[PDB]
Amino acid sequence: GSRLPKLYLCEFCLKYMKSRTILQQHMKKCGWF
Ligand SMILES: [Zn+2]
């Protein structure tokens, strides 16, 4: 295929996080609204 690894995309600013745990932490930062 394209050999593109699907990472953990943020749904607020749309960035690819490496870990789900880190994404959860990020979701707090991006959820400060
Ligand atoms: Zn974000």
Method used to obtain the model: NMR
Main-chain phi, psi angles of 25, to 5 degrees: -65, -40
Short-list 26, 29, 30, CA closest to 17: 26
CA of 17 to the centre of ligand 1 (A): 9
The H or E element spanning position 21 is: helix 20-29
Contact 9, 15 (CB under 8 A): yes
The H or E element spanning position 28 is: helix 20-29
CA of 6 to the centre of ligand 1 (A): 16
CA of 15 to the centre of ligand 1 (A): 6
CA of 33 to the centre of ligand 1 (A): 12
CA of 7 to the centre of ligand 1 (A): 13
